[PDB]
Each structure stands twice: as C-alpha cells, then as structure tokens.
Amino acid sequence: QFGRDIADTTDAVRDPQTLEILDITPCSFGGVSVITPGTNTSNQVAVL
Amino acid sequence: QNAQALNTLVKQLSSNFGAISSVLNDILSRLDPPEAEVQIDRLINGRL
Ligand SMILES: *[C@@H]1O[C@H](CO)[C@@H](O)[C@H](O)[C@H]1NC(C)=O
C-alpha cells in the first residue's frame, strides 16, 4: 500500500477507498535572488 | 564521492540520537512541552 524512493522516502500511496496509485511530489520551493545595479545609477530590481 | 556524501546527509534524518522518536509531530502529540522541548533540542543538536 506504500512506495518508497531509493533513499526510503514516501513516493506513492494507494487510495484507501478506490485502489489507485497516487504519485506524491514535494511542494515546490527554491531560493530567491534579486538582480540590481549600483544604487548610484537607478533603483529598479528584478527578482528570479 | 559527492553522491555518497549527499546520501549520508539524507540518511542522517532517520536517527533519533537517544530521543523518543525521529518525528517532530509525534513528540508534539505525545509529550508535554517541558520535555518535548528537550527532545527537540536533542534532535536539533544531532542534525546541526
Ligand atoms: C555612490 O554614491 C554615494 C553617495 O551616497 C557615494 O558616497 C559613493 O562614493 C558613490 N559611489 C561611487 C562608486 O561613485
């Protein structure tokens, strides 16, 4: 009723009522970086 | 070597380091704050 990864992390699960296989993907995340010049020229920034 | 280092770092999460369990939710839902904080501190020290 459960699957696991090569590092033994949960990756799938059968739905307990309708026996179908549901893949599990961790929620999206990531670092936030800002591109900016010397402030002696402007005050605009871009976010990546 | 890089893959093995990352594998060891990932596998280190399952240890309890002498605490009650390796899951924060179990400690929160099983013990009172005054010693749950001690268990959490133990886990924090190990992971650090
Ligand atoms: C940028 O402007 C500041 C004024 O607040 C000045 O002190 C600094 O020397 C300037 N930098 C350059 C590279 O001109």
Curated annotation (Swiss-Prot), chain B:
Changing S29A: In strain: Alpha/B.1.1.7. Residues 1-40 form a coiled coil. Subunit of the fusion protein that is processed upon entry into the host cell. Mediates fusion of the virion and cellular membranes by functioning as a class I viral fusion protein. Contains a viral fusion peptide that is unmasked after S2 cleavage. This cleavage can occur at the cell membrane by host TMPRSS2 or during endocytosis by host CSTL. In either case, this triggers an extensive and irreversible conformational change that leads to fusion of the viral envelope with the cellular cytoplasmic membrane, releasing viral genomic RNA into the host cell cytoplasm. This is Spike protein S2'. It comes from Severe acute respiratory syndrome coronavirus 2 (2019-nCoV). The lineage of its organism: Viruses, Riboviria, Orthornavirae, Pisuviricota, Pisoniviricetes.
